[PDB]
Nucleic acid binder design. Structure first.
Lengths: 83, 97, 95, 109, 95, 109, 83, 97
DNA sequence: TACTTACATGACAGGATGTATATATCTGACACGTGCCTGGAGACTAGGGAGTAATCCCCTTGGCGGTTAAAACGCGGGGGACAGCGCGTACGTGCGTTTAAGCGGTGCTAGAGCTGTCTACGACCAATTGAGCGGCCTCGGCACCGGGATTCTCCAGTATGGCGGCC
DNA sequence: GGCCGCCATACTGGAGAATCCCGGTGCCGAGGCCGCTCAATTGGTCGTAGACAGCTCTAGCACCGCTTAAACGCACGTACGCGCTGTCCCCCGCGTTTTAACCGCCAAGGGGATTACTCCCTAGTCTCCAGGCACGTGTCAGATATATACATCCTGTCATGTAAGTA
């Protein structure tokens, strides 16, 4: 029922490709785990707010629009999912 | 002799291609499972619209690429071509986090 | 059917045919401009509410909106927005 | 015996719905009364920004020889206008990609 | 002839002497407190307005405020505030 | 002939005004209608928050052997609490100075 | 009554004092004019907002509340001046 | 011989002396003259509440202090103590200026 | 000692191959036609909010006389920044293998979302009160000041380690 | 090799100025008390908002199956980060001088805010109509495919920096 490790699912070559999109030419092996940690922290910060929206909405299925609300709260407003 | 590129060249080609390309670079389904397992860390048995999963995704990679641009800024400010995590920790403190 | 949800499809399309009669548009980009117009509308609306609070004004007028534009919009964007809105409000004032 | 119901957008000679914006501000909790020229001015500003952005988007589409507006075109247009850039610095475009940006120190000799 | 300007002086003075009977105060420290109470008040009020808009609620209740507390107020302070607020609405309904 | 005047702030048993916070929320144009538990919950939150502010200010003053709160005490009170820091990362304090903060590289040897 | 060179009125030792409050030990010679320029830009933005407020308020005297609101809109909210 | 401290000793004494300080580090009158000077360019004959002048003063001082905090974080990141304006530009541009 | 010259590693000069560059296609999202109802709109109208006049007074602005505080200038000096080269290094790149992601294909009901009720629920007005703010003054905690103690900091005699030379 | 003697380098005590720190004195602003006033509440009333029930139907979830991108892991080529030494220079510290900032004092009036009057405006409501949304449905831009050029970056050769012979 429960899952224990899917932060591994954000794979190392995916991080590598993003750093290519982010413009990194050389990536230490120490980079991947701490990038996983900081994205982990950020996603927790987002999803905690999103869940707070969700039981504020009395719902059990998470919608994208509350994700938009949480991102706009945290100053990382995303275009393409509102409404 | 089989062909082999010098270091950075495929790195730079990847840099050019994903600066040109716009698609997601992470597999969507492990990301979805990660979303659900951290959801049950706050509330068990939550359900997620797929649009919410990809919206959280493009938000995640945009946040990440912003941090890595700051990381490259610090690393060239550290006179370097290889980044180390202290660059990211520095940039995270600079953003006020 | 379903409930009608308001969107900015047709007005953006009219303005697009004003600026580019020849081109098409993707629906993903269309939702992005819907988010854009809603977001900037919210920014200007909240700013106008702030200034109406600061001047203790119960009514937000085009003076307040122009002030908010001069705050948020940078430079030539602000002044040509002033020009466009001024021309529009003169035409609407002259019906 | 009422005359023709004319539209306030065309009264301003404009495309954006004056009635929608005025109703939203009446329902948006910003002021209980809204000045008469306020939504007209707001819609004029919104149409001006939207028109210049769509012009840039069409020009960028023509630049990469495409005839349809793409979010990649939106990124490459808005992020390359510096006043639109710092107008929209913290705003994310879905599937917009990134600006082509290589640092000169990253390029070889 | 002068016009009254409202400030939160006496309440912060009350709770200071409640928790520290022997402790004094400076007035510009009270200015920083007034700035604090208005700042956090407008943060919570704007977030509550946002939540009322998102869930189509025309009325901002304690659930909205508590939601805004979990959003803006981080962690341990949020749980304490939830605790004394639940006590506070409870004794209020009993009063 | 009339009920005795006993305020809702006394009903909460709390010093922060139920009435004033309620009228500022109603006047602040966030919604035209406000639930009853909203201002009492808010006032409880505010008075509690100011309570730990006053605790930290009191210990800061007791440390610097003054009985009166100075904004330097407020600086030391705010910046030494991680949740208060997360609350007030972008907030500027008049005549507060900074934390006593030196990097280890600046010290001799 | 016109003023021409009061950016130099923010003196070099005042810059040194501020960096001591910032905890800066050693300060290069190129620093001071760059600090003058960036503070000039910051002040220009803030008082541009404040002047916009004041003309929108139909006033002539710059008030500290306008300073407070201008700093709020730049995300630099200040406590201790009647806010 | 007259007494002479080694370079950095008086610097560190200034560090401790101005972190313990709370007073403004700018002379009041030339700062007021400068704000009148710059504001005259945007609107003529502007008058300033003196409290607003000290408000601008303290806000600008703390904004600069936060800037040099970001700067010397970059400097210890850059293994230097002699900060240079590229550090400030790095702090601004990573901050988004 | 400089001039020339060799050589070998840094500089000068041309190809495989991944992406760029030429159409062919077939599709389904672009794009356009259609019912509609809801969304905008208009006339009156009741009422409310902002602009305007006066004004005054108090709070800002300019002027002036000294006073060092603050700036300013200059000079000894230690530290700082940092590059050439070196050197252990740390990771990009090749590329085959595994597997679970990806695609695509089914069944179903959880709850998302939409619809009728109904009563909580809370804004609002006249009145009344009581707390809470303007005003003041005043006195004791705190600012300013003088004098040791502490404290820190720079130096210089020194002990001790280390190293060499003679027996 | 031992022994003795001599240099090297930090060990360490000592001393004096800067700042805590202790005691003395005024002063200023906390605070505490007095007078006003407005705001906050209460009772009721009246309109209405959303909570609740409940259906329904639909996409998330679960299950199933074929494919190959993923991925990852080991080898290896190769470039990275930073430090030693040095090196060059750049503000830091330590003064002196000077000047205008500061502080105290004086005169002006600007304008900001306050009260009253006024009148400009704006939404409510009711109704009416039309335009964009929902739906539906053709349809060609491009997604995909196949074939070809050129970068392009790598690879194979120029060149001169520097080492060496010798006039």
């Amino acid at each position: 029922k429960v899952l224990r490790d899917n932060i591994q699912g954000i794979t190392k070559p995916a991080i590598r490709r993003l750093a290519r999109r982010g413009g990194v030419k050389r990536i230490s092996g120490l980079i991947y785990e701490e990038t996983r940690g900081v994205l982990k922290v950020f996603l927790e910060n987002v999803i905690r707010d999103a869940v707070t929206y969700t039981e504020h909405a009395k719902r059990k299925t998470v919608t994208a629009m509350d994700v938009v609300y949480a991102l706009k709260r945290q100053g990382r407003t995303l275009y393409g999912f509102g409404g | 002799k089989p062909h082999r590129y010098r270091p950075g060249t495929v790195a730079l080609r990847e840099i050019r291609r994903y600066q040109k390309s716009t698609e997601l670079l992470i597999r969507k389904l492990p990301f979805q499972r990660l979303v659900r397992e951290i959801a049950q860390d706050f509330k068990t048995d939550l359900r997620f619209q797929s649009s919410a999963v990809m919206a959280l995704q493009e938000a995640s990679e945009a946040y990440l690429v912003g941090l890595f641009e700051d990381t490259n800024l610090a690393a060239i400010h550290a006179k370097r071509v290889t980044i180390m995590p202290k660059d990211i920790q520095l940039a995270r403190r600079i953003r006020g986090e | 059917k379903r409930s009608r949800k308001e969107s900015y499809s047709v007005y953006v399309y009219k303005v697009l045919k004003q600026v580019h009669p020849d081109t098409g548009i993707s629906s993903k980009a269309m939702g992005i401009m819907n988010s854009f117009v809603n977001d900037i509308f919210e920014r200007i609306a909240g700013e106008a509410s702030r200034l109406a609070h600061y001047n203790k004004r119960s009514t937000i007028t085009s003076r307040e909106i122009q002030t908010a534009v001069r705050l948020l919009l940078p430079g030539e964007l602000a002044k040509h927005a002033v020009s466009e809105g001024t021309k529009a409000v003169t035409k609407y004032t002259s019906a | 015996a009422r005359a023709k119901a004319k539209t306030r957008s065309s009264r301003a000679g404009l495309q954006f719905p004056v009635g929608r914006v005025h109703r939203l501000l009446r329902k948006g909790n910003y002021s209980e009364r809204v000045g008469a020229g306020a939504p007209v001015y707001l819609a004029a500003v919104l149409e001006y920004l939207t028109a210049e952005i769509l012009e840039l988007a069409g020009n960028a589409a023509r630049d990469n020889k495409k005839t349809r507006i793409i979010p990649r075109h939106l990124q490459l247009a808005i992020r390359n206008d510096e006043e639109l850039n710092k107008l929209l610095g913290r705003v994310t475009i879905a599937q917009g990609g990134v600006l082509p940006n290589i640092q000169a120190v990253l390029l070889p000799k």
